[PDB]
């Protein structure tokens, strides 16, 4: 707080102004760091209050995108209730929890002018999971097409007039937010904010909406930051995983025969500015996988409505008025092969990228990188067993071929002895969906993917005991997250530390089966050829969920 303090103020601001908002002694500790942080370097403190204050103020988004993300939250949770485990679905209707939630949600919108038009479409009780769902698809389509015809480049001088006049408020050389995260020991070569560019862009996400402000630094480098006004409060866990897989990267970079192919995790930065607003550099023009699916399906005559519509009415067609049920599973193989056969065919993403790059050279050196870091992605999923990977939760870079994810969330209770997190992933071990297998190789899938996924494990188990000394605290905070999520959490007792150690040995043991060639002549990576032998099989992809989207 006395020497460095710009490496403190971003996080001290939001944890002080969250613990001192929703709530004793800790926020009186957090006032001291801000006060002694205020005495030394005062103009740094006030000059950061300008950025935090104005970025909080002027980027309160609009009165149509709250309705957009409101609709789309209602749809992604609506089909989650429609297929979660409600019934065997014999002509369903809405349960009372839904009507209590969205009658309650009328005050969540703006006050004046939605309310006759949206309240005129569910209070009539004609919602029966056929009017409700298809109605929300109509509202999402009209609202999305409303957000086409808005402006793509809002001028900064009329949007937030202070941040254009910022660089002639010219003193003390504010360093760029988001560079004290990775280490780079010398601390004397950071880029400072020279000026904020005009023409703030405007990105219509598939499930949300955000703008990005792009900064010119004094070296002459232009690089952006996606600003997003609602960030859900499990962002912090996504940040702390972003503190973990960058933390391995030094001793993983120092190792030979990792560095020969330079796997280098390449997981993004994320800094806070608020208890609700974080900015992080979703830079120019790199997409998800789900946006490729929308571009293909609407490039075809269909839309992603017709897939879940297709398996929904085929699935319940095999139950209502005729109930054979040979099982769910052998039926799910049949509808899955119907989806691959008649919709969404093979090598759709390969047909995307080989038609997106001119000069095929530029494509080839694409996937030789794309097969590498996806490997360093899949390990990052297999270690510290996270979640399913919905294909709007992973982000491919379109320049080099990098891969990262939002939603780094580590979550069970089927064993109430050994209660906490880091139990199993359901039916497939990770994501190796066939429409990224047809792009990934079958030659790079073994010569690049497998040997990476072995090389990381033996590169991490034997520097010396690093996984223990990191994962002690970095699993411990997930334990405190597991107690503090429920209203249980009062059992901080010396079972805590061995309760950490059993999951520590579960993970360090878990990264060992793919990690050592033991005694005999194996091929090598036989735990990897085994587990990708399971992760690609259609019997195993048929039983998993439908938002996971095993067809693409």
């Amino acid at each position: 707080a006395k020497s460095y303090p710009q490496a403190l103020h971003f996080q001290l601001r939001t944890t002080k102004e969250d613990f001192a908002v929703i709530q004793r002694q800790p926020w009186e500790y957090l006032q001291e760091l801000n006060n002694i942080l205020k005495t030394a370097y005062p103009l740094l403190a006030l000059s950061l209050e300008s950025l935090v204050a104005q970025i909080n103020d002027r980027f309160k988004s609009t009165t149509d995108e709250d309705l957009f993300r409101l609709i789309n939250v209602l749809l992604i949770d609506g089909t989650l209730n429609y297929n979660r485990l409600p019934f065997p679905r014999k002509n369903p209707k809405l349960p009372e929890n839904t009507e209590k939630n969205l009658v309650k949600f009328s005050t969540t919108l703006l006050a004046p002018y939605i309310r006759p038009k949206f309240n005129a479409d569910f209070i009539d009780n004609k919602p029966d999971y056929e009017t409700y769902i298809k109605r929300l698809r109509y509202w999402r389509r009209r609202l999305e097409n409303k957000l086409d015809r808005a402006s793509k480049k809002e001028n900064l001088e009329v949007l937030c007039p202070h941040l254009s006049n910022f660089h002639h408020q010219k003193f003390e050389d504010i360093e760029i937010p988001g560079q004290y995260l990775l280490n780079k020991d010398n601390n004397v070569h950071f880029i400072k904010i020279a000026r904020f560019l005009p023409t703030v862009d405007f990105v219509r996400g598939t499930h949300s909406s955000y703008r990005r402000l792009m900064i010119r630094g004094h070296d002459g480098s232009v690089h952006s930051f996606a600003v997003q006004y609602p960030a859900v409060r499990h962002s912090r866990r996504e940040e702390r995983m972003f503190q973990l897989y960058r933390l391995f990267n030094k001793s993983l970079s120092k190792n030979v025969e990792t560095r020969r192919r330079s796997i280098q995790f390449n997981l993004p930065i994320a800094i806070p500015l608020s208890p609700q607003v974080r900015i992080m550099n979703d830079s120019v023009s790199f997409t998800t996988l789900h946006e490729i699916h929308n571009e293909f399906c609407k490039k075809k005559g269909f839309d992603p409505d017709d897939i879940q519509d297709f398996m929904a009415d085929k699935l319940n067609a095999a139950h209502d008025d005729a109930l054979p049920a040979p099982d769910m599973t052998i039926l799910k193989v049949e509808i899955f092969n119907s989806i691959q056969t008649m919709f969404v065919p093979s090598n759709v993403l390969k047909d995307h990228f080989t038609s997106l790059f001119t000069q095929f050279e530029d494509f080839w050196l694409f996937r030789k990188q794309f097969a590498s870091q996806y490997s360093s992605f899949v390990f990052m999923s297999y270690m510290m067993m996270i979640n399913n990977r919905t294909p709007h939760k992973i982000h491919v870079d379109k320049t080099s071929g990098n891969v990262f994810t939002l939603e780094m969330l580590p979550s069970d209770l089927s064993l109430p002895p050994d209660s906490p997190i880091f139990h199993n992933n359901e039916p497939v071990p990770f994501r190796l969906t066939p429409n990224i297998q047809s792009l990934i190789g079958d030659s790079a899938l073994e010569g690049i993917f497998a040997v990476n996924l072995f090389t990381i494990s033996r590169a991490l188990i034997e520097p010396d005991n690093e996984l223990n000394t990191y994962l002690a605290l970095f699993i411990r905070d997930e334990i405190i997250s597991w107690f503090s999520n429920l209203h249980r959490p009062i059992i901080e007792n010396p079972q805590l530390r061995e309760m950490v150690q059993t999951n520590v040995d579960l993970i360090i043991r878990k990264v060992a089966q793919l990690g050592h060639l033991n005694s005999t002549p194996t091929v090598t990576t036989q735990f990897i050829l085994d587990c990708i032998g399971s992760a690609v099989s259609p019997r195993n992809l048929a039983r998993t969920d439908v938002n996971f989207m095993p067809w693409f």
Binding site: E257, R259, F360, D442, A444, G447, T524
Partner: protein, 575 residues
Amino acid sequence: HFNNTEITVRMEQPFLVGTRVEDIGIRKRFMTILDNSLERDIKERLYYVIRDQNWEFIADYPWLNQALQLLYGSFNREKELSLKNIYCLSPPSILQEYLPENAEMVTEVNDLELSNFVKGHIASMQGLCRIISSDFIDSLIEIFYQDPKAIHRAWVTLFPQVYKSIPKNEKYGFVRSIITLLSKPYHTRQISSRTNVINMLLDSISKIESLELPPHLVKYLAISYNAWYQSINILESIQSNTSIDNTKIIEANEDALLELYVNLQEEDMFYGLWRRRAKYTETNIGLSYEQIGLWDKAQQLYEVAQVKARSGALPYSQSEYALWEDNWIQCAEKLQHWDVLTELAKHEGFTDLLLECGWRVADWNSDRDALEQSVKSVMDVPTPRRQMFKTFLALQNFAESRKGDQEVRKLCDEGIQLSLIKWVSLPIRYTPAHKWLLHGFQQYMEFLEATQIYANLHTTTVQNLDSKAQEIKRILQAWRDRLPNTWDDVNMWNDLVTWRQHAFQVINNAYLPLIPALQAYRGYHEIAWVINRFAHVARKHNMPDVCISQLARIYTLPNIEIQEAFLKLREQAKC
């Protein structure tokens, strides 16, 4: 028009040179001679782009502008050219019938300057577009003659579409002709370097969807040119196109595709292609133990593979034999064991044995005249490695006799120039195959600097050592900064270490009469630098037993003095 009493030499000899003319009316008169005397059916002109033009047009200029003349001169007189992939801007008509509600309904008040105005558009824009195909073509041709990047972007878009009318019963003839155009038109095309050369006619084949099924060696011989990354299109496409039928096409595509990967010498797209191509498991075990860096167990598993070979099992695909013995030689050369394969280099492998010239020796004066009876008989088709050896023999001959020949500093520089020829053969992206060449440059500026070091001590027989010759401390201190990096490859590390030890032994046995006069203290003993350092980097890859056995040339002249015992016992203990 038909008088064949003149010989037709000059409709071939300057006539096809008549578009090199760099004069407008000249060139247009020659091409209007050609295009007003030939046929019109575009298939029977696409023959006479490939069947005719027997002029080689040796190595000068992209001759496909004239090809695009012989097919662009057969389009039609269409006056619409309806563009159909862009969803054009907001309409004049249909956008102005989107208000039925409030009947404003102006009723013919066209008495203003608008009466002068609006009709003036309709007379204009009906005649302002009027776009015909031929006028659109004839202003694109002069884009070609200024710049050769539009002929490519027009040929790639054209050629797989005129080919869409090449029906069967004329298919194998066009394939059989285009084979004779890509590789052997009795002509070697050294047409340019790094620019547009054959890629126009080599990218577009990949956009065909399968005319290219026979040749596969034509598709490989075009690698002395450009088009590295442009033929991997043609070879990787069959794996997503072939069937079970005619597997010899398939494994032919995989094996010469593999040695395209050998020329590019990336290995991660090589082992996967073997282990999804191979038959025996022991290739998968062996190659999978190579790519981690564990060459000793891959050596052992190949030794298991030969005794399982030549039996009643699968025929080992008649190339895994060479894979086992060539990787046997490689896995030998990585660790140590320079002494073992010397007599195997004698019974076969003439070009091998000059790589086996580090037989724990550092003098070569026992066979100083017995090597260039092989070096001068290997410098047919030279490489910068073999040229580096032929530079090294005179580099040591100048060290043996005082004042020598000084032939090296006009013998080395073609050593650089051949490596730059190989640099230009490789493509423009940083391939790892460039990697060796960088180390190659790092040795050449160590050869010429070699001709500065001991030649400044052959000349310095002045007997003023340890007070004048501080150039040893300066430039030998400069030998400890081109270290190279701790992850490159083991072969080039042992190369740099042993050959720098040849230089050290020149500056030991070239000091052999200078010894008894004093033994301030001069004695070098800094071969322990590359031995303790190479022991550390020979630990950091793999193989602790090697850096144990590479602390074996340390028991010469004492090697104890400043820090050599420190990291000697540090690395030998901590190993």
